[PDB]
Symmetry: D5
Subunit: 89 residues, 10 copies
């Protein structure tokens, strides 16, 4: 954390634990997908791709927790997720 | 900024990389601002930090929707868990 | 996140620190997004990256104004150079 | 120091990158010096640190003006908030 | 990679991809377990613990690949895994 | 070195942390040495690097066995996949 | 700092503050000088070059403070600064 | 991993670089393992950490001997100080 | 280790870069050693740390003299402030 | 800068940490300088870099001797391999 825990509210520190978890999951997805493209061993590629897609599940579960515990995550995710049409509108 | 040479990476893999790292940086900004909002002792600064914080969540949501539309398993797993009720680990 | 122990830092110094590091992070995001806007090969992603990029500039601007209002030398030097004509080094 | 290959970046984008990172480093120096000014217990050193600190703000202001002149959205947003009177938000 | 790809054999580079994956999985196991102890929200704690134990599975699968593709991983893992008695005397 | 305050971590969690970061450092050394073994143009150095490399694998295996004996889920997952035949993802 | 502040003398910590400041000035000098060579905008280049040279003044001022507050900085700086001929021979 | 482009470095410089960074990594492992031995509260883990630690010292010593044999000033300065008597500075 | 591509950097700029980063590394070593001299509880180690510390200052001074001889503004500003009397800001 | 809380580390472990990290920094300086010696195109600078380089080796040898005198396993393993003539991986 960037600020002393003494001044952070309990909810802020739990959301921090969730946010940094999603960040690490996102990094694993990207790392694994790049290694899937570059790997020259098909058995390794199958393991990497399997783990990659489970990191996406890990991230989705934690993002749902954030949505349920943060009004503005809920509002903004409701606005854009599972839509059609230009996203910037 | 990629882990493997760009010559061996598919074009779509690199575009998802650009989106993924963007979402990561937005999430980092949400966390950073929320912590600074708790710690700040200047009300005018707090209002700015909180304003920015919640717009970073919008940036993250937009980029995540692009990722969802361009990656089948992001779409599948987000569909399983987002906007649900009851235990998340049971959905 | 501070380089000196908080016990010896004035409250206002820590608040300006919170503002300065926020501007720094916004500036990094602007640069990161602008480079991805040039390199992106998906137009839908590019529009999102460009939208976010320009809102980071607004976040930086709001926090910069707070700094101007809370630091006399930020005020002096920003007054000298921002919104001028002619060579910048000669203002 | 760029995140994308120079081959795909427009020339103006790389110059704005040079300006942006310069402002970031100036901002970092302002923050570092101001903290050391508070903590220093030697008046002669403190005077030097404060002198350097305030010149870093001038370095940042000049480079920011270049950005304002070379990026329409920097100009737009800086004009909205800089040198204003009421609540910033 | 720490050396130019031009001087690395393909199998060395594939083992690198596997090794670094295991490293990242281990780091995730450690991070999640600490967050499980520290979390004060029961729903978050259940997610963190679920993710933690699946990272161990990711690591195990990747370790088996290393065992099958590296004679000294095979030898040393065979010597120590699933043993009884002092680990430093096997 | 811990991500959470030691005050809230169970002793076993901290000891597993010590073992896990040790295995990570062994793995990094294995990878670093193997690449330097491939790139080195001095056979006497190569022989030292290769010797050290294979001993790091032993240090990792010893520490993993400690993890296996002190963590039921390490024991379960390692039992499932190590020393198998056939597709690794299906075991 | 690398050691706990309770065991560090006051003068050591002030010298630390000056030393780290010189290091950051030197880094800015190097960064700006490389951007001056690479920049393709003359108006930007003039700003970068102006800032670059003032960093040198910030480092020089702080180094003088070190010289006045550290006997060995004073000795070694006097031996080599403003000399002629092979620097390693002084 | 080098600070200068490989095209301007002599072969002998890059091999010494490989050895030096190896020794640095071994030294770091000795230090980490030694601190963990002091802090560990599981005797079985402590025996493993202490075993690995002491083998890292052997890895460093082997690689350092290679440097001594491939660099005239390493040989000169190590001969001056290692295994001496009396104040180290005055030797 | 440069921030701009070497093809657009002049030879002299790169040589100045080599000198500047060397001075930076010397300064860091001076600081690191001086803190360890204060904190060490072993007198013979303290004597080695202090010996090394003072030679790093000599290394920095030599390299800084090279910079002075190869950069007009280093020569100007070091001339103005080094070996002066009175308020350092007033010189 | 320790990896474990100072409250649980023995005094001798902390002093060995101070020496170990010192050698690591000396080694890194040797490597950095040696690469700059090869890449430098200014003979006056190259002479300084080479002079400094070789003194860093002396700094490393002095601190390494302290380690030898204050750690039984460093002494044992250094004695086995330093100042030998036969193949290193054969004791
Ligand atoms: Ca492929
Ligand atoms: Ca295979
Ligand atoms: Ca004030
Ligand atoms: Ca004060
Ligand atoms: Ca001035
Ligand atoms: Ca010990
Ligand atoms: Ca000497
Ligand atoms: Ca002999
Ligand atoms: Fe995961
Ligand atoms: Fe944003
Ligand atoms: Fe922002
Ligand atoms: Fe500056
Ligand atoms: Fe995983
Ligand atoms: Fe090891
Ligand atoms: Fe400066
Ligand atoms: Fe080792
Ligand atoms: Fe030195
Ligand atoms: Fe040194």
């Amino acid at each position: 954390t960037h600020e002393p825990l003494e001044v952070l509210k309990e909810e802020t520190v739990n959301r921090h634990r969730a946010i940094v978890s999603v960040m690490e999951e996102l990094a694993a997805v990207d790392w694994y997908d790049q290694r899937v493209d570059a790997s020259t061993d098909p058995e390794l590629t199958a393991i990497l791709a399997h783990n990659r897609d489970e990191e996406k599940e890990h991230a989705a579960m934690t993002l749902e927790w954030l949505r349920r515990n943060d009004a503005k995550w809920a509002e903004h995710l409701r606005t854009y997720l599972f839509t059609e049409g230009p996203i910037t509108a």
